[PDB]
């Protein structure tokens, strides 16, 4: 879902309706997960909690 919404925000940005988003990962996800989620989504207009 992080990839899907990131695509959406990028699509609207290209359409002249700028957007940004904040997102998180599950319940108490640690470094092992976060560094796998971050590498999959290393682009602006999204932030990971």
């Amino acid at each position: 879902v992080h990839a899907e919404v990131a695509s959406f925000v990028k699509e609207r940005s290209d359409a002249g309706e700028p957007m940004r988003a904040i997102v998180g990962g599950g319940f108490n996800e640690s470094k092992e997960q976060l560094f796998g989620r971050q590498a999959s989504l290393s682009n602006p207009r999204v932030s990971l909690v």
């Binding site: 640690s30 976060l34 971050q38 989504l41 682009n43 207009r45 932030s47 990971l48």
Partner: protein, 49 residues
């Protein structure tokens, strides 16, 4: 929270939002330490911050 005095650097450099629990001499509260996005590079604030 898993993150200590150095883990907040690993989160921030990787572009991950980090929330800390603060303790003063008398009272406690919570605050956010950075507004970094999931962009890779730190040099360009327009993408990063």
């Amino acid at each position: 929270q898993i993150y200590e005095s150095i883990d907040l650097d690993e989160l921030n450099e990787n572009g991950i939002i980090s929330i800390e629990f603060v303790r003063n001499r008398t009272n406690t509260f919570f605050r956010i330490v950075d507004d970094v996005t999931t962009f890779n590079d730190k040099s360009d604030p327009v993408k990063a911050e």
